[PDB]
Write an enzyme that holds these catalytic residues in place. Structure first.
Site, PDB file in Angstrom:
ATOM      1  N   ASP A 126     -16.436   2.353  -2.231  1.00  0.00           N
ATOM      2  CA  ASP A 126     -15.294   2.326  -1.394  1.00  0.00           C
ATOM      3  C   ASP A 126     -14.235   1.534  -1.995  1.00  0.00           C
ATOM      4  OD1 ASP A 126     -13.423   1.776   0.566  1.00  0.00           O
ATOM      5  OD2 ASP A 126     -14.980   2.101   1.928  1.00  0.00           O
ATOM      6  N   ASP A 166     -18.819   5.234   9.640  1.00  0.00           N
ATOM      7  CA  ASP A 166     -17.461   5.732   9.805  1.00  0.00           C
ATOM      8  C   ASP A 166     -16.977   6.429   8.525  1.00  0.00           C
ATOM      9  OD1 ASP A 166     -17.157   3.597   8.281  1.00  0.00           O
ATOM     10  OD2 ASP A 166     -15.609   2.622   9.476  1.00  0.00           O
ATOM     11  N   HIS A 167     -17.855   6.402   7.539  1.00  0.00           N
ATOM     12  CA  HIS A 167     -17.649   7.020   6.256  1.00  0.00           C
ATOM     13  C   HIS A 167     -18.673   8.113   6.104  1.00  0.00           C
ATOM     14  CE1 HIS A 167     -15.640   3.255   5.619  1.00  0.00           C
ATOM     15  NE2 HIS A 167     -15.437   3.462   4.335  1.00  0.00           N
ATOM     16  N   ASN A 218     -11.064   1.329  -0.798  1.00  0.00           N
ATOM     17  CA  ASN A 218     -10.071   0.915   0.190  1.00  0.00           C
ATOM     18  C   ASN A 218      -8.622   1.257  -0.102  1.00  0.00           C
ATOM     19  OD1 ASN A 218     -10.582  -0.312   2.816  1.00  0.00           O
ATOM     20  ND2 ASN A 218     -11.963  -1.652   1.694  1.00  0.00           N
ATOM     21  N   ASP A 265     -21.811   0.779   6.486  1.00  0.00           N
ATOM     22  CA  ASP A 265     -21.226   0.089   7.642  1.00  0.00           C
ATOM     23  C   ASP A 265     -22.308  -0.347   8.633  1.00  0.00           C
ATOM     24  OD1 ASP A 265     -19.680   0.597  10.590  1.00  0.00           O
ATOM     25  OD2 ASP A 265     -18.592  -0.646   9.101  1.00  0.00           O
ATOM     26  N   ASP A 325     -13.378   6.768  -0.668  1.00  0.00           N
ATOM     27  CA  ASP A 325     -14.608   6.642  -1.431  1.00  0.00           C
ATOM     28  C   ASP A 325     -14.536   7.572  -2.637  1.00  0.00           C
ATOM     29  OD1 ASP A 325     -16.197   4.840   0.515  1.00  0.00           O
ATOM     30  OD2 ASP A 325     -15.514   6.410   1.858  1.00  0.00           O
ATOM     31  N   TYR A 373     -17.248  -2.344  -3.099  1.00  0.00           N
ATOM     32  CA  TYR A 373     -16.699  -2.201  -1.790  1.00  0.00           C
ATOM     33  C   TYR A 373     -15.507  -3.110  -1.928  1.00  0.00           C
ATOM     34  CZ  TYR A 373     -15.694  -3.010   3.005  1.00  0.00           C
ATOM     35  OH  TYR A 373     -15.023  -3.094   4.189  1.00  0.00           O
ATOM     36  N   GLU A 421     -20.888  -1.822   2.477  1.00  0.00           N
ATOM     37  CA  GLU A 421     -20.850  -2.399   3.841  1.00  0.00           C
ATOM     38  C   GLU A 421     -22.228  -2.447   4.427  1.00  0.00           C
ATOM     39  OE1 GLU A 421     -17.959  -1.595   7.065  1.00  0.00           O
ATOM     40  OE2 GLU A 421     -17.480  -3.561   6.413  1.00  0.00           O
TER      41      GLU A 421
END
Ligand SMILES: [Ca+2]
Length: 276
Positions: A168, A266-267, A170, A28, A241, A129, A54
């Site tokens: 990731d 944030d992960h 999602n 991120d 993830d 991702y 990200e």
DNA sequence: TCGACGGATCC
DNA sequence: GCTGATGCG
DNA sequence: GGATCCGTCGATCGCATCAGC
């Protein structure tokens, strides 16, 4: 409540020790991640392969720092065709891959720098991702088409070598992968659709969710929390993830971990141990 | 994720 | 380089 | 009639762009 990841089972079901440590992490912002000392954590965890999602950073704007970064000499990046600061992924490897592929092989789905394939001697590794279904489910339609293609390409892939997919995805597979399931059932990431997809994908290819294969009933084990509303403070997160193993590799699986105490995005990074 | 709004529906 | 604003998630 | 129910539906934190100069 809170999660405490168990210590690292570094031995196979069959007593053979772990040989191969892949680490995955939605970064991120790769530059902000590094400024936030993420690479330190990488160095100390000393994986054999590091996958990032990200990265939000173009090829040339890539920082100097990961040049010196040793043990992860071979480095590969995809970043979207025409949209800067968006998406992007990268795969760093201690050993050199047999062959590296970008995208999944459909035009529509290969323009946002999401997928790196990397085939090693005895397995093939994909880092992705997955596109967010979008706030307000504005891009929900698209991501049902993504899923179906990612599937049929992942299935083709596994047909040839055994595969590890990480990254990731999602999708919050089940209500155990979410702190607040019932207040999210048509927020993106927990729609009936996207959980439907994940399920197809595991049965389609087929693939095992390695974390849930070893801890089928541990709750509150999460990989992502919004920087907003104090979300990581109370561990009100999700599990976005995964490490999705082919069934061939299930006898190679020594453990699958979630490194919660690792700041920088944030992960949090996840970590796979195999005997290969 | 959170709290403010709704507009209901309840003893 | 710097201020504003917008995108994304 | 007032206090609780449950569906919305508004700003938050962070990273990175962009327009303009
Ligand atoms: Ca947008």
């Amino acid at each position: 409540a809170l999660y405490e990841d168990p210590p690292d089972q570094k031995t196979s079901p069959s007593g053979k020790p772990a040989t191969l440590k892949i680490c995955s992490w939605n970064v991120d912002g790769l530059r902000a991640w590094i400024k936030k000392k993420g690479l330190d954590w990488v160095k100390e965890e000393a994986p054999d392969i590091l996958c990032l999602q990200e990265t939000k950073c173009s090829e040339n704007k890539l920082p100097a720092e990961l040049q010196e970064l040793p043990g992860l000499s071979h480095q590969y990046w995809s970043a979207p065709s025409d949209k800067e600061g968006y998406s992007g992924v990268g795969l760093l490897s201690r050993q050199c891959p047999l062959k590296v592929s970008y995208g999944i092989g459909e035009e529509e789905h290969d323009q946002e720098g999401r997928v790196i394939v990397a085939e090693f001697d005895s397995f093939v590794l994909v880092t992705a991702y997955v596109p967010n279904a979008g706030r307000g489910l504005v891009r929900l339609e698209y991501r049902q088409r993504w899923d179906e293609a990612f599937r049929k390409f992942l299935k083709g892939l596994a047909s040839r070598k055994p595969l590890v997919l990480c990254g990731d995805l999602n999708v919050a597979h089940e209500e155990i992968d979410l702190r607040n399931p019932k207040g999210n059932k048509k927020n993106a990431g927990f729609t009936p659709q996207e959980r439907q997809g994940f399920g197809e994908l595991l049965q389609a290819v087929p693939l095992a969710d390695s974390f849930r294969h070893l801890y089928p009933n541990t709750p509150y084990a999460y990989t992502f929390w919004t920087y907003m509303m104090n979300a990581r403070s109370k561990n009100v997160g999700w599990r976005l993830d995964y490490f999705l193993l082919s069934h061939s590799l299930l006898p190679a699986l020594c453990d699958s971990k979630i490194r919660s105490k690792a700041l920088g995005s944030d992960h949090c990074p996840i970590t796979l141990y195999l005997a290969l």
